[PDB]
Design a binder for these strands. Structure first.
Length: 94
DNA sequence: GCCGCCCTGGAGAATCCCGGTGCCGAGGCCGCTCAATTGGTCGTAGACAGCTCTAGCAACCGCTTAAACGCACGTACGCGCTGTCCCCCGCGTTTTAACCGCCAAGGGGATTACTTCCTAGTCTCCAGGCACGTGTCAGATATATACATCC
């Protein structure tokens, strides 16, 4: 049975930040739970933001506002940067 | 004989009650009006059945061993009492700014209606990324055997 997860992406991000460090299966379960929880929080806040403004679509502005609302302080400030240029790079390609 | 002082009766004005009439809050009625209802059609979500494989469960075993438990002692700490002093509370007096009512113009933003176009949903086809399994390979580890040496 094909069970989807964020395992390989968390592993390759780990190899970016720590190329000689491994990880255990329980820590990967915790990382998968963290990514799913943060995805659910940001998507729910963006859904509420689209509902309050009478908009039928979720754009990058809603995700940016949800990140500013949920992420505390400087963690938002870099992440709002880290999303934006990625969107810009996507605009440079697609 | 004339003048001043005390006692008692009926008429004029203030107040309570009732009836006619006008004004505030709320409900019935009417008109618009848009969203719920009804009727029909169709696609698919989910119920049902079937087979396979793995986890759980009730009740028992046996062994090990570390945790739990009971007890004695001792001493450290919770708690009560007392003093003290200091800081917060109550009150009187003076200030002061909140609050309410006012300009004066201008912009922000909520609606209503309208136009337009870009972008995201949908569909079809395809291919490569992800998941799983395996052959192979270099680093780590353990020992076999030969050489220098102390007693």
């Amino acid at each position: 049975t094909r069970k989807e997860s964020y395992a390989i992406y968390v592993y390759k991000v780990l190899k970016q930040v720590h190329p000689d460090t491994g990880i255990s299966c329980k820590a990967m379960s915790i990382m998968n739970s963290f990514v799913n929880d943060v995805f659910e929080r940001i998507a729910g806040e963006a859904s509420r933001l689209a509902h309050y403004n009478k908009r039928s679509t979720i754009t990058s502005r809603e995700i940016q506002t949800a990140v500013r609302l949920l992420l505390p302080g400087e963690l938002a400030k870099h992440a709002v940067s880290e999303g934006t240029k990625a969107v810009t790079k996507y605009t440079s390609a697609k």
